[PDB]
Amino acid sequence: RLLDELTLEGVARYMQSERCRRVICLVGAGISTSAGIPDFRSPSTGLYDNLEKYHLPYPEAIFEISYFKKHPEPFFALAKELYPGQFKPTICHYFMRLLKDKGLLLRCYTQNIDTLERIAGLEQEDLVEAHGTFYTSHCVSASCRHEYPLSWMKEKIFSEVTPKCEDCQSLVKPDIVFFGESLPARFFSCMQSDFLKVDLLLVMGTSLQVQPFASLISKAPLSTPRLLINKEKAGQSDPFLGMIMGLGGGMDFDSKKAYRDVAWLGECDQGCLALAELLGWKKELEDLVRREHASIDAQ
Amino acid sequence: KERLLDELTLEGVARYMQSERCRRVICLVGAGISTSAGIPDFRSPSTGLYDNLEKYHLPYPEAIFEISYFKKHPEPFFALAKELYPGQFKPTICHYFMRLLKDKGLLLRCYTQNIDTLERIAGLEQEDLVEAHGTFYTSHCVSASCRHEYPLSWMKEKIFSEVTPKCEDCQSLVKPDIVFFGESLPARFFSCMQSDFLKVDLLLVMGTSLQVQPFASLISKAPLSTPRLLINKEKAGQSDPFLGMIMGLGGGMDFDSKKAYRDVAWLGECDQGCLALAELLGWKKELEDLVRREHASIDAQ
Ligand SMILES: Nc1ncnc2c1ncn2[C@@H]1O[C@H](COP(=O)(O)OP(=O)(O)OC[C@H]2O[C@H](O)[C@H](O)[C@@H]2O)[C@@H](O)[C@H]1O
Ligand SMILES: Nc1ncnc2c1ncn2[C@@H]1O[C@H](COP(=O)(O)OP(=O)(O)OC[C@H]2O[C@H](O)[C@H](O)[C@@H]2O)[C@@H](O)[C@H]1O
Ligand SMILES: [Zn+2]
Ligand SMILES: [Zn+2]
């Protein structure tokens, strides 16, 4: 057992030890809510509770490839809000930057498409954008798959014209991963090597309600500690018909068999400040946030 | 990761089954093994149950077996339940093939997702079976504080009288013990799985799309050396990892890849796949006799 106790304090002590060389961060929409971007599944405020005007059969249909090919209009109307480049990164994002600058970040796997990891200064090599990007777009026809740049797709979205491919007249969509679509090739190539050598999983701002991303927590070695920083416990629940996690694939924070998983419940920004304080990084983190935000405000 | 099959074919499985290494077989079955009996499955286009619920005006097909939707709108399920009641059909060749595995001392367990009871009618006993998605046999009040049990005849009476079954003690809804989405699986599912998959020598997967958890996880619970044979109309368990996939990452079948070492896909009718495997094992005549007499015996009632 690598943690001396199942607390943030225990995780911090482990992080400072020579045994903790490589950290993987797994993040979702929760890490961007304090920047002003709603998550997906939070009641009332979440995106899936705010799609009534689109008259969908159910909320998730707006990001389902099969529904999209039949009724693409709602997604492209919503896309005007989803397009990145008008929010600043959060304290949580800069904490991951700090991990990078301390030589501790093996990888950040993100489910987000807001690009705040990149704006916060994480580089392409540090990142797996697991659910894709707006940066590039592709024709949906597998036979054709013609690629279109951000400007091309952006021009179509903000002109309210449904993007059609110039070669085959099929729909063109941004490379954000829809339900039913394959994840980027980088996800799998990085996963297979990263998870053999990870010393700590830092899971932040995700409900772990979607596969294959939810599987990642179970790819780590059994000895690797896992810290969740989130408003609610995620990944720990009793099995039931239609559960997302595979049997035994979840977190165990609270059973009498718990040995490596720690749930810090609260806001991601505040959890990262608390961890930073325990590591003696709090002033460094605060200075980085202040400087980088002021640098963004400069333009 | 020892390779126990000499070749990734049905003939290689048959040879492995005849060797001394193969002592314990587990069957994992779904609605595909019962369509030839006249019971449609769930997810097949046009024929499947989920494509034939228009009359109930559901938000989506699965709602009719979702516990939250049920409590709020119980009427549609109970209307459908009149059709779901088991005992108007005969078991299939596939069911009798599993019975033959029992009698040959090869069957450790059959885990079924079905509630049609055809495994029992074919001669599999309580001890041989894990009815993973429950049963009509018993019914219970839905209130966690009460859980008052009701017998088969009590639920029938309410269903065919078209009265929504209510608890005589606490007046909460009473439903048959079939597992709805969002509900716990039977205790027996977990207790059996914990021990059964430690020393299983062969997995026989038949007539399922492996589209629901936690049942879909069962193929990953076998040792990495245990061969796995799929007998199904379509390939299931093998797919490129996509957003919203049911299987956990790397928890699927590997039939077609370069690394493929233990998994075999026999594509076609479950009954025909079972007849074919039986022939390779020398049981063809024994299986056909069993099916004839049992069908006759049921008709002879
Ligand atoms: N400030 C905060 N601090 C801590 N936790 C938070 C905060 N805000 C929200 N949360 C928690 O953060 C979590 C947000 O969960 P979800 O909204 O499901 O986002 P995902 O990234 O996991 O969604 C994954 C995919 O699903 C979609 O289909 C898309 O494809 C997504 O990429 C919850 O547990 C909140 O309590
Ligand atoms: N005669 C046949 N021979 C071979 N394969 C067949 C045959 N007929 C159908 N199939 C295949 O059989 C498969 C039928 O798959 P599904 O209809 O999803 O049934 P499940 O048992 O997996 O459903 C699991 C749960 O989901 C529900 O919510 C309930 O809770 C269920 O208990 C397909 O791959 C067919 O191609
Ligand atoms: Zn095209
Ligand atoms: Zn009751």
3-state secondary structure of B267: strand
Supply angle C-alpha B161, B165, B168, rounded to 5: 120
Residues 6 or more apart whose CB falls under 8 angstroms from that of B258 comprise: none
Q: Are strands B149-150 and B174-178 parallel, antiparallel or unpaired?
A: unpaired
3-state secondary structure of B175: strand
Q: What is d(CA B146, CA A144) in angstroms, rounded to the nearest whole number? A: 60
Q: What is d(CA B173, CA B168) in angstroms, rounded to the nearest whole number? A: 10
* Active site (annotated) includes residue B95: no
H-type alpha helices, chain B: 10-18, 67-72, 75-84, 93-103, 118-121, 152-160, 187-196, 270-281, 284-299
B243 Cα–ligand 3 center, Å: 22
For A69, phi and psi rounded to 5 degrees? -60, -30
- Tokens coding A17: 């030890």
3-state secondary structure of A149: strand
Determine the distance in angstroms separating the CA of A139 from the nearest CA of chain B, rounded to an integer: 18
* Contact predicate A49/A56, CB 8 Å: no
Tell whether B35 is in a known binding site.
Answer: yes
B232 beta partners: B267
Task: Report long-range pairs for B49-54 (Cβ below 8 Å, ≥24 apart).
Answer: B53/B80
Q: Are strands B149-150 and A200-204 parallel, antiparallel or unpaired?
A: unpaired
Q: What is d(CA A6, CA A262) in angstroms, rounded to the nearest whole number? A: 5
* Contact predicate B241/A212, CB 8 Å: yes
* Contact predicate A263/A253, CB 8 Å: yes
Tell whether A108 is in a known binding site.
Answer: no
The label of the residue with tokens 């689109």 reads: A54
**Chain A residues inside the 8 Å CB shell of B59:** 57-58
Residue A147: alpha-carbon gap to chain centroid: 24
Nearby residues for ligand 3 (ion, Cβ within 5 Å): A 139, 141, 144, 146, 165, 167-168, 170
For B193, phi and psi rounded to 5 degrees? -65, -35
The label of the residue with tokens 């093996």 reads: A106
The label of the residue with tokens 């993987």 reads: A24
Q: Which of A116, A230, A244 to mutate to test the pocket of ligand 1 (most atoms within 8 A of CB)?
A: A230
For A274-287, b/e burial (b = at least 16 CB within 10 A) is bbbebbebeeebee
3-state secondary structure of B230: strand
Q: What is d(CA B57, CA B55) in angstroms, rounded to the nearest whole number? A: 6
Q: What is d(CA B37, CA B74) in angstroms, rounded to the nearest whole number? A: 28
Domains and CATH numbers, chain A: 1-33+90-130+185-299 (3.40.50.1220), 34-89+131-184 (3.30.1600.10)
Number of helices followed by number of strands (H, E) in chain B = 9, 9
* Contact predicate A262/A228, CB 8 Å: yes
